[PDB]
Structure formats: C-alpha cells, structure tokens
Design a protein around this ligand. Sequence first.
Ligand SMILES: Nc1ncnc2c1ncn2[C@@H]1O[C@H](COP(=O)(O)OP(=O)(O)O)[C@@H](O)[C@H]1O
Ligand SMILES: Nc1ncnc2c1ncn2[C@@H]1O[C@H](COP(=O)(O)OP(=O)(O)O)[C@@H](O)[C@H]1O
Ligand SMILES: [Mg+2]
Ligand SMILES: [Mg+2]
Ligand SMILES: [Mg+2]
Lengths: 535, 180, 60, 523
Amino acid sequence: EGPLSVFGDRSTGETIRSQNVMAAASIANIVKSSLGPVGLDKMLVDDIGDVTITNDGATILKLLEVEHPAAKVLCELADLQDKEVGDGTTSVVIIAAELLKNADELVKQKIHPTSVISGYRLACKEAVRYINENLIVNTDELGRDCLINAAKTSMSSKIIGINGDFFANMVVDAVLAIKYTDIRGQPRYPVNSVNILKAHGRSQMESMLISGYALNCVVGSQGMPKRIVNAKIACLDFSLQKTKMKLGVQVVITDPEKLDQIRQRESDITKERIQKILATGANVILTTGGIDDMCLKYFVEAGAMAVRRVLKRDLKRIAKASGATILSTLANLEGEETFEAAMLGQAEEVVQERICDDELILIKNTKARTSASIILRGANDFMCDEMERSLHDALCVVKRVLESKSVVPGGGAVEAALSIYLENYATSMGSREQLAIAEFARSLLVIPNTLAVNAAQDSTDLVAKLRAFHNEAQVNPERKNLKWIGLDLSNGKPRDNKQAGVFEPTIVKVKSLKFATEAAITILRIDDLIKLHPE
Amino acid sequence: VEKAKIGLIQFCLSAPKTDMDNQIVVSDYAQMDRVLREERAYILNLVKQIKKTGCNVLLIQKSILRDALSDLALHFLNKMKIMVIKDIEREDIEFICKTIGTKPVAHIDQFTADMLGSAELAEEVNLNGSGKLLKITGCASPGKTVTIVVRGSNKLVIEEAERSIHDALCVIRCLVKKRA
Amino acid sequence: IQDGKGDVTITNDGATILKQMQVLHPAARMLVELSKAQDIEAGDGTTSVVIIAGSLLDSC
Amino acid sequence: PVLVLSQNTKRESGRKVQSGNINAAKTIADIIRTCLGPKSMMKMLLDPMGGIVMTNDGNAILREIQVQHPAAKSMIEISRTQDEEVGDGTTSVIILAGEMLSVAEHFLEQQMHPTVVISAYRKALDDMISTLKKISIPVDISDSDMMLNIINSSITTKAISRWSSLACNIALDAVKMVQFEENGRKEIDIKKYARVEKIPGGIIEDSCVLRGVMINKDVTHPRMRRYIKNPRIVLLDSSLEYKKGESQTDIEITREEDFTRILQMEEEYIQQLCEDIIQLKPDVVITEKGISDLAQHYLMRANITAIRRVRKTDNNRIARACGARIVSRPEELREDDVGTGAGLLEIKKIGDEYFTFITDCKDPKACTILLRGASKEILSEVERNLQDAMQVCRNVLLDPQLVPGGGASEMAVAHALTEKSKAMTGVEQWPYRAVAQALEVIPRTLIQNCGASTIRLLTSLRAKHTQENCETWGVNGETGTLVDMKELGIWEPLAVKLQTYKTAVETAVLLLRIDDIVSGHKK
Ligand SMILES: Nc1ncnc2c1ncn2[C@@H]1O[C@H](COP(=O)(O)OP(=O)(O)O)[C@@H](O)[C@H]1O
Ligand SMILES: Nc1ncnc2c1ncn2[C@@H]1O[C@H](COP(=O)(O)OP(=O)(O)O)[C@@H](O)[C@H]1O
Ligand SMILES: [Mg+2]
Ligand SMILES: [Mg+2]
Ligand SMILES: [Mg+2]
C-alpha cells in the first residue's frame, strides 16, 4: 500500500464492484432450486444434530451464517418480506440479485453508475402503474371460488401440495371465523390468533378444525372432573396460594397466646377468596399463576376444574371469545373485595381429550364470539414443523385478498407482460437512460427461466412463445385476452391462468418490486471497502 | 382517545414509602386484615383525584428506586377509561412540555385542572408488523417544535437517509445567520 | 466501512468516513479534527475543506 | 487475506443426495428384518451405563443406536410414533418403509421428476384404506373366549409365548378393570393406573394380578398391628408435625414462663390435629409427608396404623381402588372421603423386605401387576411384552374390527391395486404398481425367517388369491405352508394395520423431496 496507514485493507475500482456481485449471486443460487410447483425441499443440519427441512426463503437464509456485507443485505431483505406480506420470500431475492448482475455489464462499460440508478427508478415507477391496469377484482368472480384458488396456489410447492383441496377449505373456514368488527369502516381479519398445535400420529388427512379454542394444558389434580357440559369460565390473573406479608411488613410476637390465631389467618384469607368465586356458579377456573395444593382441594368437592400456569396470550383470546373479563384483583370501587356474576364466560362443552399419549383441553361452542384452532397430524416432528410454516404462508395470502380486493394472474404471466411494455417504453427516451430501462425488462424475465428449468423442460422455446403471445395482447386490440396465459409446468404449454385458477394477491408483486429495486441501488453505489482488523 | 387532556406526573402510585427506613410491626391477628384494607384505600384515593380533573391520557416518569405503577393502580385506572403510558425518560420532559404545553406535577395536592394540556387526537398507530407507535396531534397550545419520522428498508439506508436530512437542515441554518 | 467488531456502515459524509477510519500518522490525525470543526458551524462542505487543506500543504 | 462467504459450511447437492438418502434408509431395515415372525431371534445391546438390553422389540433396538446421518434419524423417529400410537407394529413399519423407498430409485433413474412419484403414492394410499375396510370383520366384546385369541396371536412372537395361557388372563383382567366413566360420556382406558412391579426371584408362574395396590413400605411404630380385616383408610397430603410459616415471624420473650409456654403449644397443636382424625374412626392413615414422633403416640392409643412418606403416584392409585379423596387440611374431614372399599391389609416379607398389600376390594378401578422370575434382565423383557398385550386389548374396545394376519392382508390389497391400475393411463401407472408390489415383503420375510423356498411359496400364494373368495389365505410361520387363517386363528386389530400403512407412505414421501444438504452452521 504505502501511504494511508489505516491498519486494515482496502479494495477500489472494479475489484470491489465485481466482488459485491459474486457474493450476491451466490446467495440467490442457494434458493434457486426451490421455486414453483416443481421445486424440492432442503435439509439443514447444525453442529449438534438438529434437523430442519424447509424450502421457504425466509427460514433457509435466517439459519445460515453469512458475513459478507454485500450478502447480508439480501438476507435482511427476505426477513422484511415475511413481515410486511408473508409470501414471496424467495421470489424477491432472485429478482434483486439478477438486477445487480445486469447492472455490472453496464458499469464495466463507460456507463456512469448514476445513469443506471436514475433509469431503474423510472422503470420501477411505471411498472407499478401498469400492474394496476392488469388488475382483477375478486367480487366480479365468485367470492368462494376466488379464495379457494388463491389459497390453494400458495399451498403448491409445499409438503401439503396434493392435499390442497382439503387444506384450502380449512384455511378459509378459519379466517372467516375471526373476522373482527370495526366501527363499520372496514372488516378486520387478525392473523396469528388461531392456535396451531402439532401432534404426530395419524395421516395428515386427519387434521381437524376445532370450533372453539384448544389449550396445550392439563388439569391440575386427578380428582377433578374432565368433562363439563355447561361451563362458566372465570379467567384470573393472580396466584391462589397462601397469603404472606410483604417485604416491609414483619411479624413480632410478644405474647405467646396470640400466635395460633395469626398462623391460622394465613390459610383463611385464601379460603374466603375462593368461596367468593364458587358461589356465583363458576365451573372452570383459569389462572396464569400457580395454585397451591391446599387450594386444589376446594375445587374437588365443588365439582370444578382448575388449570394452572396458562399463558397470558392464550387467556386474552379465551376471555375475548367467551365474554369473560380478565381481572388481576377482586377489589372494586369501594374498599371491599367482591365478585359479581356479570363477568363470567359461557361455553357449551369443555372436554379434556387425549391425543397420542399426552392430553389437551378443548373449549367448544363459545357463544359470545367465534374462535378457531388447528391441530396438525403428521408422521414425526420434522414433518409437522413444515406443515405449520406452510400453513402460516397460506393464512397470510387469504388475509391480503380479503383486505385488498384485487388479484393478479400467477405462473409468470406478469413478468412476461412487463418485459414487453418496458421494451417499447424505453424507445421514447433517446438518452443514456435507454440502456438502463432495457436492462430492467430483461431482468424481470428470470422468473419463467427458473420455472422451466426446475421442471426439466425446454426454457428457450417456452419463453419464446410467452413473449410472442403477449406481444399480440398489446397491439391488435381485437386480441386483448392473451395477457392471461402464464406458464404450465405439468405439461409444458401455455394455458389460461385466468380460467385454470392460478391467482396471486397484487400486494405481493407490487411490494417485491419496490423492495428489490431499493436494495439494488444501495449496493450499486459502493466504490470502496475498508475492513478494519479485529482487536 | 379523542379530545384528550394530557397530564405529566413525576410521583409514583404504589404502597407508601418514606425516605427514612420504615417498617410495619404486626402483633395481633386483627391487624393483618387492616394492612390490606388500608393499603387498598390509599391507592384508590389517588386515582379518584385524577378522575376529578377530567383526565384521559396519563404520562408516568421513569423511577428506579421504587415502583412507579403497581398492578392495583392499573386495575383502577382501566375502569375509568384512562390511557396509561409508563417509562418516560428524564431527558425528554422539556421536549414534551414544549410540544403539548403540559405543566409537570410532582405532588398530589397540585394536580389541578389547569396543570393539564389539551389536544385533538391521541391514538396509537399499528405498522405492518414492525411495531407500534404513538402520535398526539392537534395541540391546543402548540410550541416551536417539530418531529420527523424516517422510513427505510435496511438499517444502512435509514442511517444514510438520516444524515442526508441533517445536512439539509444545516444549510437552512446557514442562511439565517448570514443572509447571502 | 466495516468496523473490527463486525459493524458495517455505508456513508458518504466526509466527516463520517474520517471518523470511522483508524489512522496512525499524527499529521493525518489533525485532518480529522479539521473536518469536525466545519461540521459544527457550517454543517456542510466537510469534504471540500479536506481537499483544500490537502492541496495547499502539497503546494509547499 | 483469508476471506470467506459462508464460514466453512459443507454443502452437497444433486442426484448424489437422493441416492444417499435411500441407501441410508435401506440399511436401517437390514438390521431389523430378522426379528419378525414367531421364529425370530434375539439381540442384546450395551447401554452407556453398563447394563444389557436383550429384547425382540423393534423400537427398543433402534432407540439405542446413535447414527450421524440425517436421513437415518427420520427412520428412528417413526419407530416410536408407532409405539406411542398403537403399541404393536414397530417392526413391520420399518421393513415396509424400506421396501417402499427402495422401489422408488428405479423410477428416479429413468428421468422422472420426484413430484410425479408423490402423486402416485398418495393416490394409492386412499385405495389401501378403502380395501382394508372392506375385508374387516367385526368382533363381539361380550365374548370372552374370543378376546383371549386376539391377545394370544400378539404375544405368540415374544418370549412370553411359553406361558401364553397365563399372560392372556393377566392383560385381559387389567384392561377390563381400568375402564371407567366419571362424568358425561367420556370412556377412558388409561394405563397409568396399571402399575407393574418387578421382584427378582420365585417362578414366572407366580405372576398374578392383585385386586388392589401393593406398596413398598412398613409401619412406623413396631407396636402397631399388621393385619386388619375391614379397614377404613383415610388418605392425607399434609404433614402431621409443627412447621414454620412464611410471613417473617419472630418471637421476643422477656419473662420467665414465656419459654416453656411456647414449647407447650407445639404439643397442643399436634393433639388438635389428631383428635380431628380419631373423630371419624379410621383404621389406617396414609400420608404423602412425614409424621412426628408425638403424633404416633396419639395414634396407637386409638389403634390406628400409619404409613409415612408415600409417593404421590402411589397415593393416587389407592384412591382409585378403595374409594376416597385426598384431603390436605384435617379440619375439613367428612364421611364421604373415608375409604370403605377394601377387605384386607397385611404386611409380609418377600426376601428380607417388607411389602404392604391392600387386596380384596369390592369394585376396584386400579390394580398392580406382580412379576416374579429369574433376574432383572428377564423381568425387563416380560414388562415390555405385557405393555404390548394391553395396548392391543385397549385398541379392540375402541375399534372392534379385525383383519386376517400372517400375510393374508398384504396380498389382499396387492391384488386389489393390480386390477385397478389396468384401467388407468398415462405415466402414473408404473409407480402405481410398485407401491402395490412392495407390500409383498411382509409375507416374504415370514418364509425366510422359518427356512423355506421363497420362490415357490410366493408364486403359489399369488395364484391362490386370483380366485374370488380367498382373502383370508396366508402363510404359516411355523411350518412353511399356505393355510387358511379361518382355522389357524391369527387376527390383528384394524387400528394397527391402518397406522402401519399410513406412516410408511409419508416417510417415503418426505424423504423423496430432498435434493441438497447444508451441513454445519452452529445454530
Ligand atoms: N400451480 C402453479 N402453476 C404455475 N406456477 C405457480 C403455481 N403455484 C405457484 N406458482 C408460481 O411459483 C412462483 C414461486 O412461488 P413459490 O415457489 O411457492 O415460493 P414463493 O411463493 O415464496 O415465491 C410464484 O411466482 C408463482 O407464480
Ligand atoms: N403364527 C404365526 N404365523 C404366521 N405369521 C405370524 C404368526 N404370528 C404372528 N405373525 C405375523 O408376525 C407379524 C408381526 O410380527 P412382530 O415382529 O411380532 O410384531 P410387529 O412386527 O407387528 O411389531 C404380523 O404381521 C403377523 O401376521
Ligand atoms: Mg407463496
Ligand atoms: Mg454538501
Ligand atoms: Mg408384534
């Protein structure tokens, strides 16, 4: 080096521009074999022997140890898609890494890097406006046929691909049950409110949808009943143990005769509190804290159930769905402690079922609201953990369609249509931005190339036909229904993706364009690396 | 909450604690029930003074030597339709007082309906999954303060986007000092 | 710039690059404190002041 | 300098992985296939502690093996999924999975995509279930001589078969006692209340099922009685002694009589507790905690017998066999929680060790199984076989359906799919007949293990099923000839067969969807 003693190293020029791209293209090459209905899974083994089988892009990249700074940007990009949308986590990394690769050929020539960035921002802006021309509103088609198809499309390329027509009905019937009512401006459909429980056992066609709530808990003592028909839910948030004095309060005895009465009063305060609860007709007692064994005897002769150490996130949903109120103390607006009867819940069957040795507690037919929970049955622990992750991706797809009433055709019909519109749009610029826009059109065409390659098909004539069909959809207005073909990987011919039933929410493709362009800009503007030596 | 009355507090709402080391001695079974009863009427007394003024949003300052809000005081406060916001730092009290115009209160006898700052809307927003945030807009007595929210996709873009804005503020500062 | 702890920061300000670097020559450690001063009063031109100071010392 | 991208991560991909996963699964089946059928041999293991595990069970062998290959770890786990679901069939599920996974590589080398084989395997699994439910024959629960034949055909393979006339009446008289209905229409058969006690010595013919519970404890005081005719036992949970509290209590004394007055109250506290128990007139007191020496003085005055420090689980089965409930505070003692359902209480010596017997119960809902034998290794294999006999009996009551065994069921479904595949067309036909012809491994291992020509007996059985009514013809596992299962009397519950066919197909489906391994990432 010579001058500039920084106690590190540095790389400048084309050395760092062609190294930030081989690091980005390698990460995209890992997940390039897990795209589309003909993609396979992967296996991940750590140093202790914990096996994870998955194909989604958010979980493979998260578990891998990556330390190249130009590669970690793509890893954090995938984690953004899973939170904002929830689907398309491997489709966005491929576009982002392809955009850099097409931009190197220009920068290695005498094209300034700022001319590429300006052209990229223009192409991303007009590619979103055109998509809104290519929109389909679900309400025109059948409501219950635009959700089964949209949910089943997200189910392909997973372990539950063949069982889509069974799992599609379950997902739709689980989202409509938790439809929250707003101030009548817009329905709200919360997710991660259903409880998904894994339990190995019978086949995956034996999974059941519970019309209520399911708890991963067991009853406290063996003497209590395990089936209550008309149950009165009383949700609590405090421990039913023996009382004791606080840190600042001590007991000093000067007369030996006043000792027995004091010791007796430690076990009497908690006795009165329980009697106040059971007198209103409570049948089931749910506590987030712990219950002493002396306090479990009062529920025995009373014919009541008591479940201890219940999670707070679970108690919130049980209380909301049954009409009960979560109270952290028995006090009221006066100095006394009371317990009215207008703040209990009401179910119609609380039965403790048994599933593969260990047990659980179901709560069925809640009258206040409707709730759902899903119990998954698989072969072993590896198979069930992949059915949960592939079911979460399906729940988020249905929520976006109901919220945003618009879908776009799947199977590569959008990128093939966008690579046509952007090609004739760049012909009206007449500047050095002409080259940048043409590269955006060619970079989008990578989705069909990786679909016809994973299917062991010819990816040259198939994509040649796709561009030929869509070129007739823009010109010749008498033929404008040719923009809904896409690609079929079961036979190898372009079918009608509109009639076949391949659909995708429009917020998936719009967001993936904006995230893939902003990530390509920040990597592209770097002409120097200094790496400091560790201390 | 709409049409809220914000109020800053610097004292705590828990069991009574003095600066001197104190302790309570019990030598009879009848006094055990009084400690719980008289404790419960002390917290309830302070909550009933806040609702008398007509308060909707509460801002508690951070305290480390003693508890600032017990589970009993929160149970009473929810029953009176009041929003409670805890863990406020000691360095940004001035910026809060400069924005909504709120007299700080450090003693219960000084909690009067004039120590309060009005507002139009005070509600929490929910993002796409990146967290929650609090916005109080439409202050009746606005000051000379403003705030900016910076949004980005990566942690690297946010930092560069923040430094770029700070550069556009220093140029406007240069123009007022030397109008040339 | 990548720190030795594993922290990466993509920057363009002249006052930030010179702060993150760890130089050892005493004559160059005075150039960092020069750009700090311009960032305090002016707030802009931190890159220009280093080029000017680095070109005058050369003409000498 | 030394720059990296993935920190020494070992990645493999391509067709090399697929052939590596299949060969790892076939090796697991090669270890176990000699332990199927009545002529099966025995293995011993060597655990890291120093003991010896000698058994025939298919799950007790694979669970002790440490294998580093990820594809082999999935075949170890499905063994215990069958064990915890149905109890029987831990060996047939591993041999079948290997054969269903070996016949797949023939199609993968013919330029066929693995997703095509998946749809053929799942399509054929919906035809295996419909065919098995067609040849199912109902059973009658009230028939007692039929329930002895089902259990006998399940333990005729283990080392208990020498005493099949004895273990049939042990595993039948225990399941019929546990069955119980507390509230509503919930019927449970829980094997937590069937305690099995192993005692080295004696002879295996002394193994019996007592009408109550057996505890390993003794009387606290020697002057207490050891033989009561009709006891009224009361069960406790608290300790009968003076303890401390938790509210930070201290005592300050300044007079001369305040020290001895405090010590006198500890004895009046104990007398108060004891008089709350003698009021109900018990005979025996059972507690899960300690008992003081003074509390024993007040209990020999009323002729009460006490047992100190009984386990929680042993103290739960007593309430299920005598009839009582656990009380903690002796002040809330009533008449409905005094146990009057026993008829004997004696304390014997079995080889220089005292044992507590509570037998002769009116209507017990919990029992104990007393095993005697030669060593601790022999009694361990008896317990594993009995846990197999009760899990078969429990499944019959929950699903009274039977299917022919010995290999008659595998050919019955193999015939049905070969005649259904000739009406289909396309490229899905060839993996449709490999799944049907892979089931012939169950009756092929039954011929090799006894010793016979497996190339003449197999073709004499395939042509035997071509007739319209031959669905029950199987292969005798003792001589080596084709006999009807209507006269031999080999039957198995439907729940066992449905779980063996369903688990094996999904293991084949899961391992046919891998194409790269990423080894090593430190969590
Ligand atoms: N049945 C199908 N036919 C054709 N293409 C499909 C089908 N299902 C999904 N695709 C396409 O596969 C692409 C990738 O989806 P996938 O591989 O499931 O991962 P991700 O959804 O995370 O991108 C999507 O762009 C979608 O258009
Ligand atoms: N006497 C017999 N003759 C022929 N086959 C038998 C006989 N007894 C048991 N079998 C067969 O042995 C198989 C089960 O063998 P085993 O290893 O003991 O249990 P599993 O393999 O089901 O765990 C069953 O398929 C049954 O048909
Ligand atoms: Mg998807
Ligand atoms: Mg500038
Ligand atoms: Mg068996």
